[PDB]
Specification:
Layout lengths: L7 E4 L4 E7 L4 E8 L5 E4 L19 E10 L4 E12 L7 E13 L10 E4 L15 H8 L6 E5 L4 E8 L7 E9 L10 E6 L2 E2 L12 E3 L6 E4 H14 L16 E3 L12 E6 L5 E7 L1 H4 E3 L2 E5 L1 E4 L3 E3 L1 H4 L2 E6 L4 E7 L11 E7 L10
Parallel strand pairs: 3-8, 4-7, 14-22, 15-21
Antiparallel strand pairs: 1-2, 1-10, 2-3, 2-6, 4-8, 5-6, 6-7, 9-10, 9-23, 11-24, 12-13, 12-17, 15-22, 16-20, 17-18, 18-25, 19-20, 23-24
Catalytic activity: Broad endopeptidase specificity. Cleaves Glu-Val-Asn-Leu-|-Asp-Ala-Glu-Phe in the Swedish variant of Alzheimer's amyloid precursor protein
GO cellular component, one term: neuronal cell body
Enzyme class: hydrolase
């Protein structure tokens, strides 16, 4: 696992990517680690934003599936030709597997000009893969063709360049402190979990827990911000404004638009509240909680910061904002996701992030949306 430590790189806001090789001979490509999707797709044509791309014709092990794939978006998309080839992760488990690969030949609003990645590794379940759930995701193929345990863990460390670790097939004790707590994976499509309570500085936000998971909550390394549903968002902001009312900020700030700056080294951390998310536990009526410091939802860009908490309309998304404070274990074998304080999170000299429990929480099922 020490071979896999620090195997993730990236640029602030551009996601985390891991190095991979495809085809024979091996072609090196940087791939985005996305637990919010399920396709392994890489650029396979000279799009101007790409440092490089997958060249099928040069791989003796490449197999054309004579099938196309089209993945839409809010207003963009990527499309390509399906196939399979030998895939490997140089700084991962010492194995090689034949996996489905979507060679991207055309796309819009997908690649980022100036980024250093050329593809995406969707680690979620087949259920949301494209064109349909028959296209086996990379991880399923990794597990079914080798003896790598069916689980991976992520330690996203933020900072400009960012770094992290994706421990494949295991858990590395040196990446976290305290104990690991597990929440059940409600359903195997996205990495869906259930939030049963939210607190700001220790004070309940007083809301029906169902509003916290409307219309779902997921753990997504592919998203940058902690995204809360409207009702929840406004409630959270109203509460954070109050806590930091000692100072005023333009409406643009609370919208991730306009930023805020303070003399280098004089950021008033103490005036920003800590947020607590209570997740359903492994035992009936039992829950646990995770708390992020403001250094988590106030990401840098003299010191300037941008509100890293935005509203959503597609449910709660626990992106880098949340994940960067914890070591997240995607225990696929046991349908659960574990959290523990990350060994690389940024902390105050007074307040400290945490993962604690147990707590007694009744009718947690009711929090789930249907």
């Amino acid at each position: 696992f020490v071979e896999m430590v620090d195997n993730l790189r990236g640029k602030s806001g551009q996601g985390y990517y891991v190095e991979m090789t495809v085809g024979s001979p091996p072609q090196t490509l940087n791939i985005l680690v996305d637990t919010g999707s399920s396709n392994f797709a890489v650029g396979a044509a000279p799009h101007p934003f790409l440092h490089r791309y997958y060249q099928r014709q040069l791989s003796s092990t490449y197999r054309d599936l004579r099938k196309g794939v089209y993945v839409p978006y809010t207003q963009g998309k990527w499309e390509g030709e399906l196939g399979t080839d030998l895939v490997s992760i140089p700084h991962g488990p010492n194995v090689t597997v034949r996996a489905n690969i979507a060679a991207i030949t055309e796309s819009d609003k997908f690649f980022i000009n100036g980024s250093n990645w050329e593809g995406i590794l969707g680690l979620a379940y087949a259920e949301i893969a494209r064109p349909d759930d028959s296209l086996e995701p990379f991880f399923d193929s990794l597990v079914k063709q080798t003896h790598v345990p069916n689980l991976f863990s992520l330690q996203l460390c933020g900072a400009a360049s960012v770094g992290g670790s994706m421990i494949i097939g295991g858990i590395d004790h040196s990446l976290y402190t305290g104990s690991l707590w597990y929440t059940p994976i409600r359903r195997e499509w996205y990495y869906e979990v259930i939030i049963v309570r939210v607190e700001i500085n220790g004070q309940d936000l007083k809301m029906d827990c169902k509003e916290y998971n409307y219309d779902k909550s997921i753990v997504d390394s592919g998203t940058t911000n902690l995204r809360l549903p409207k009702k929840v968002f406004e409630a959270a902001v109203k509460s954070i404004k109050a806590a930091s009312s000692t100072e005023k900020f333009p409406d643009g700030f609370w919208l991730g638009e306009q930023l805020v700056c303070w003399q280098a080294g004089t950021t008033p951390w103490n005036i920003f509240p800590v947020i607590s998310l209570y997740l359903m536990g492994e035992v009936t009526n039992q829950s646990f909680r995770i708390t992020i410091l403001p250094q988590q939802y106030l990401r840098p860009v003299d010191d300037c910061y941008k509100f890293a908490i935005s509203q959503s309309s597609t449910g709660t998304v626990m992106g880098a904002v949340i994940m960067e404070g914890f070591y997240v274990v995607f225990d696929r074998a046991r349908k659960r996701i574990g959290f523990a304080v990350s060994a690389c999170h940024v902390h105050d000299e007074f307040r400290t992030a945490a993962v604690e429990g147990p707590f007694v929480t009744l009718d947690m099922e009711d929090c789930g949306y249907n």
